[PDB]
Amino acid sequence: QALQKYSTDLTARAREGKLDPVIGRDNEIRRVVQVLSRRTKNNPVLIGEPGVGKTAIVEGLAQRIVAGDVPESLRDKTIVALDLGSMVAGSKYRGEFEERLKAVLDDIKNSAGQIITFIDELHTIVGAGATAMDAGNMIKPMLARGELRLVGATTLDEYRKHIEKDAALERRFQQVYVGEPSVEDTIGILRGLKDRYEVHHGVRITDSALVAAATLSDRYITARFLPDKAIDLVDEAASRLRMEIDSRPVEIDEVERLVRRLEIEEMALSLAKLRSELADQKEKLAELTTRWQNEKNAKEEVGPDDIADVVSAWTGIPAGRLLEGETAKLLRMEDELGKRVIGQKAAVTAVSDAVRRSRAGVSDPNRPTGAFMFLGPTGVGKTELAKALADFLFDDERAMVRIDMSEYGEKHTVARLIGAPPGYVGYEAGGQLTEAVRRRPYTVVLFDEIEKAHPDVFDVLLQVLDEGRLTDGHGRTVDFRNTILILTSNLGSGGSAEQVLAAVRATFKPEFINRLDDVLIFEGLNPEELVRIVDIQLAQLGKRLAQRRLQLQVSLPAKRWLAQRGFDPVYGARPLRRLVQQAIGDQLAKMLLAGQVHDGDTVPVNVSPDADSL
Amino acid sequence: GPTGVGKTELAKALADFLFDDERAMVRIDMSEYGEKHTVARLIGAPPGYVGYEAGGQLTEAVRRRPYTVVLFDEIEKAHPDVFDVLLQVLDEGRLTDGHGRTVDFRNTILILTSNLGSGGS
Ligand SMILES: Nc1ncnc2c1ncn2[C@@H]1O[C@H](COP(=O)(O)OP(=O)(O)OP(O)(O)=S)[C@@H](O)[C@H]1O
Ligand SMILES: Nc1ncnc2c1ncn2[C@@H]1O[C@H](COP(=O)(O)OP(=O)(O)OP(O)(O)=S)[C@@H](O)[C@H]1O
Numbered sequence: 001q002a003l004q005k006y007s008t009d010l011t012a013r014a015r016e017g018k019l020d021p022v023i024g025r026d027n028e029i030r031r032v033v034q035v036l037s038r039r040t041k042n043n044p045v046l047i048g049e050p051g052v053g054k055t056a057i058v059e060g061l062a063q064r065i066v067a068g069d070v071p072e073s074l075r076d077k078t079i080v081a082l083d084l085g086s087m088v089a090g091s092k093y094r095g096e097f098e099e100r101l102k103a104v105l106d107d108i109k110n111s112a113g114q115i116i117t118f119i120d121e122l123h124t125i126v127g128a129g130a131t132a133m134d135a136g137n138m139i140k141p142m143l144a145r146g147e148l149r150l151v152g153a154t155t156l157d158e159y160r161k162h163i164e165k166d167a168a169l170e171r172r173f174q175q176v177y178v179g180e181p182s183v184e185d186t187i188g189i190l191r192g193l194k195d196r197y198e199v200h201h202g203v204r205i206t207d208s209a210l211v212a213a214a215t216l217s218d219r220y221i222t223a224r225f226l227p228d229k230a231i232d233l234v235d236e237a238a239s240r241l242r243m244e245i246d247s248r249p250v251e252i253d254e255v256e257r258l259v260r261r262l263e264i265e266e267m268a269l270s271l272a273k274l275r276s277e278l279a280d281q282k283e284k285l286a287e288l289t290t291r292w293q294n295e296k297n298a299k300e301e302v303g304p305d306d307i308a309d310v311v312s313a314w315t316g317i318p319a320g321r322l323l324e325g326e327t328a329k330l331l332r333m334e335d336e337l338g339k340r341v342i343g344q345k346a347a348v349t350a351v352s353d354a355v356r357r358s359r360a361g362v363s364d365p366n367r368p369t370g371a372f373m374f375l376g377p378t379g380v381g382k383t384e385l386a387k388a389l390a391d392f393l394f395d396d397e398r399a400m401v402r403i404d405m406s407e408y409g410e411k412h413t414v415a416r417l418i419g420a421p422p423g424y425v426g427y428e429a430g431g432q433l434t435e436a437v438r439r440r441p442y443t444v445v446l447f448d449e450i451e452k453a454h455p456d457v458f459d460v461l462l463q464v465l466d467e468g469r470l471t472d473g474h475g476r477t478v479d480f481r482n483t484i485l486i487l488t489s490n491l492g493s494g495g496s497a498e499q500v501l502a503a504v505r506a507t508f509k510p511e512f513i514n515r516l517d518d519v520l521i522f523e524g525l526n527p528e529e530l531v532r533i534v535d536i537q538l539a540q541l542g543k544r545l546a547q548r549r550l551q552l553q554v555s556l557p558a559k560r561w562l563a564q565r566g567f568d569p570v571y572g573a574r575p576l577r578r579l580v581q582q583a584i585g586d587q588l589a590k591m592l593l594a595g596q597v598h599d600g601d602t603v604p605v606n607v608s609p610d611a612d613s614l
Numbered sequence: 615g616p617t618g619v620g621k622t623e624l625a626k627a628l629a630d631f632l633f634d635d636e637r638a639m640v641r642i643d644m645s646e647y648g649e650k651h652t653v654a655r656l657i658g659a660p661p662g663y664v665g666y667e668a669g670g671q672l673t674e675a676v677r678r679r680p681y682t683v684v685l686f687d688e689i690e691k692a693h694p695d696v697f698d699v700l701l702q703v704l705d706e707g708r709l710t711d712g713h714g715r716t717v718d719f720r721n722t723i724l725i726l727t728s729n730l731g732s733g734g735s
C-alpha cells in the first residue's frame with residue numbers, strides 16, 4: 001500500500017485512453033524492450049536534446065503493453081510512475097525519510113517481478129537527503145542485481161553536470177540516444193494528432209496547414225527542435241480561429257476600441273485634428289461593418305494562411321502571401337523611396353529589387369537577402385539612403401543596427417562584436433553584434449566607413465555573407481538568414497569609373513569580392529537636380545517650426561538663388577545645409593528672441609540683391 | 615586551390631549519404647581565431663574559473679555521437695597556436711578538457727579547407 005500513496009499509475013490511465021497516440025520511432029521502442037528484458041543491469045535512460053519526445057516513448061510503451069504487441073517476457077507488467085517530490089514531503093526528523101524510501105523499495109522488491117518503475121527527471125536522485133552523502137546512493141546495491149527496472153528520461157546537458165559527476169552510478173544505467181527527426185517524418189507525426197485538437201476546439205484543420213507548418217516553421221523559429229516546434233503553430237492557430245467565433249472578427253474590435261479611445265480624449269479636451277481622424281476612422285469602421293454584414297449574408301476552418309500569420313506575429317519577420325495589405329505599397333516602393341533620395345535611380349532600383357525578389361519567394365532560402373556594398377564620392381547620400389529604407393519597412397529610424405568600423409583600428413577590437421572566450425572577464429554579455437540580433441531578427445544592419453578598419457575584421461564577416469550563421473562565446477548559433485546587410489565606403493571619390501574598381505580590388509581579397517552581391521557605384525550630382533533638394537530641406541525646416549507654429553512663405557528667386565550657390569562638386573550636397581542656416585537660420589534667430597515675432601503668422605522671405613532679408 | 619571551385623560543396627555532399635541529412639556535421643569556422651586565447655572556446659576552461667561546467671564547443675559535440683564529419687573553414691587566418699591544439703588530434707585521436715576526459719577522434723573524417731596562393735602554376 002506504500003506505492004499507492006507515493007506513486008500514481010500509468011497502465012490504469014492507459015486502459016481508459018488518456019494518452020495521445022504515439023506514432024513512429026519503432027527503433028527506440030525495440031531498443032528499450034531489448035535493454036529492459038536482459039538478466040542483470042537492466043534500466044534504460046532516455047537521453048536527447050529537449051523537446052524531441054522522451055516521455056511520448058514511454059507512453060507508447062504503455063500503449064503497447066496495454067495492447068499486447070510486447071513479447072512473452074514483459075507480459076502484463078503494469079508500469080508505475082514514482083515520485084521524488086512526494087517522498088521528501090515532510091521529513092524534518094532524523095530517520096523519517098529513510099524508512100519511507102526503504103518501505104517503498106521493499107514493496108517493489110516484495111512483489112513477483114511485476115512492477116516496472118518509471119522515474120522522470122532522474123537527476124534529482126543525487127541530492128536527495130541533505131544531511132555526508134547517505135541518500136540517493138542507497139539503491140546502489142539494488143540496481144546491480146537488477147531488481148527494479150527503472151525507466152528514466154533526462155536531458156542531454158543536465159546529465160554531464162550531475163550524473164557524470166558521480167560515475168559509480170553511471171555504469172548501472174544503459175543509454176538510449178533519441179535524436180530529433182526530420183520534416184519527412186514530422187509531417188506523419190502531425191497527421192495523427194489531428195483528432196484531439198478537433199475535440200478541444202470544435203473546428204476543422206486542412207492537411208495543407210500541416211504540410212505548411214512543418215515546412216515553414218523550420219526556416220523562422222530556430223530555437224526549438226522539430227516535433228515540439230511545429231505543434232504550437234497548429235494549436236495557436238486553432239485558438240486564433242476560435243477567438244473569432246464571437247460575433248465579430250478582429251479589425252472591427254480594434255477599430256471600435258480605437259475610436260472609443262479617440263472619442264474619450266477628444267471629448268475630454270472639449271483639438272480638432274483628432275476630430276478629422278475620428279471621422280475617417282468612423283468611415284473605415286463603417287465600411288468594414290457593412291462588409292462584415294455582406295459576408296454574413298453570403299469562415300470556420302484554418303488554412304495555410306493563418307499559420308503564416310502566427311509566424312508573422314511572433315518573431316515578427318512577416319512571411320505571409322502578401323494578401324494585398326502592402327502590395328500597393330510594394331508596387332509604389334520606388335516612387336515612395338524617391339521622395340527623400342533624389343536621383344541615383346540605377347542603384348535605388350537595385351535595392352528595391354533585392355526586396356521584391358524576396359517577398360515573393362524566388363531567392364535562395366539559406367543566404368542573407370541583401371548583402372551588397374555601394375560606394376562613390378562623399379556627399380551623394382549613401383548614408384541617407386540607408387536610413388530611408390528602414391523608415392517605411394519598420395516605421396522606425398532606430399530599429400536598425402548601426403555599427404561603425406572606423407573604431408576598429410587595431411586587430412584585437414574584433415572581440416567587442418563576438419564576445420570574450422569562456423573563462424575571461426566579460427562572459428555574461430556575449431557579443432554585441434550577436435545579442436542585438438537574437439531578439440527581433442528582422443532589422444537592417446549598417447557598416448559605416450569600411451575603409452579605416454584593420455584588414456582582419458574582413459575575415460570575420462567572410463562567413464556572415466555566404467552562410468548566414470555566426471557563433472558567439474557561449475555557443476548559441478544565431479543566424480543572419482533574413483536581415484539586410486549594407487556596406488559603405490569612400491574609395492576613389494572622383495577618380496574615374498574604372499580607377500574606382502582598381503582600388504576596390506587592390507584593397508580586398510579575391511575571396512571577399514566574390515561573396516558580395518552587385519557592387520554599386522553612386523554618381524555625382526547635377527546643378528539641375530539641386531533645386532529639388534532645396535525643396536525638401538525647406539520643407540523639413542518648415543516642419544520643425546511646429547514648436548511655435550510659424551511657417552515660411554518662400555519666393556521662387558530665393559529658391560533658385562540657393563540652388564545657384566550650391567557650388568564645388570568635390571563636397572556634394574553637404575554645404576547647402578550650412579548655406580540654409582547662414583542665410584535663413586541666424587537671421588531668424590536674431591529676429592526671434594528680440595520679441596516681435598510672437599507665434600502665429602509666418603514671415604515672408606525675399607531676396608535683396610546679394611543677401612536675402614526677411 | 616583557387617576560389618569558387620566546389621571545395622565546400624564537396625565537404626557537404628559526402629556528409630549527405632552517410633547521414634541522410636546535411637546539418638548533422640560539426641561545422642566550426644576558424645576564421646575568427648586571430649589571437650592566442652580563443653583556444654578556450656573549443657577546449658574548455660581549467661577548474662576554478664568562470665565558465666567551468668560548459669566544456670568546449672569542439673569537445674562536447676563529438677562525445678555524444680562519435681561519428682560526425684568535421685569541417686575547418688579557412689585555416690589560414692588562425693594564429694599558429696591553434697595548429698598546436700590540432701597537432702594531437704591528428705595521429706593520436708585524443709585531446710582533453712577541464713573535466714579530465716580523453717575524447718577519441720578515431721573514426722571521424724577530418725576535412726581542411728584553404729585558399730593559399732590561388733593560381734599557383
Ligand atoms: N512520436 C510522437 N508521437 C506522439 N506525440 C509526440 C511524438 N513525439 C513528440 N510528441 C509530442 O510532442 C510533445 C513532447 O513532449 P515531451 O516529450 O513530454 O517533452 P520532452 O520531449 O520530454 O521534453 P522534456 O525534457 O521532458 S520538458 C508532446 O506534446 C508529445 O505528445
Ligand atoms: N541625394 C540626396 N537627397 C536628399 N538629401 C541629400 C542627398 N544627398 C545628401 N543629402 C543631404 O545631405 C546629407 C548628407 O548625406 P550623407 O549620406 O550623410 O553624406 P554621405 O553619403 O554619408 O557621404 P559620406 O562619404 O558618408 S560623409 C543627408 O543627410 C541629407 O540631409
Ligand SMILES: Nc1ncnc2c1ncn2[C@@H]1O[C@H](COP(=O)(O)OP(=O)(O)OP(O)(O)=S)[C@@H](O)[C@H]1O
Nearest residue numbers: 511514616617618619620621622623624727728729
Ligand atoms: N563543380 C561544381 N558542381 C556543382 N556546384 C558547384 C561546382 N563548383 C561550384 N559550385 C557551386 O559554387 C557555389 C560556391 O562554391 P563553394 O565551394 O561554396 O565556394 P568555395 O569553393 O568553398 O570557395 P571559397 O574559398 O570557400 S570562397 C555553390 O553554390 C556550389 O554549388
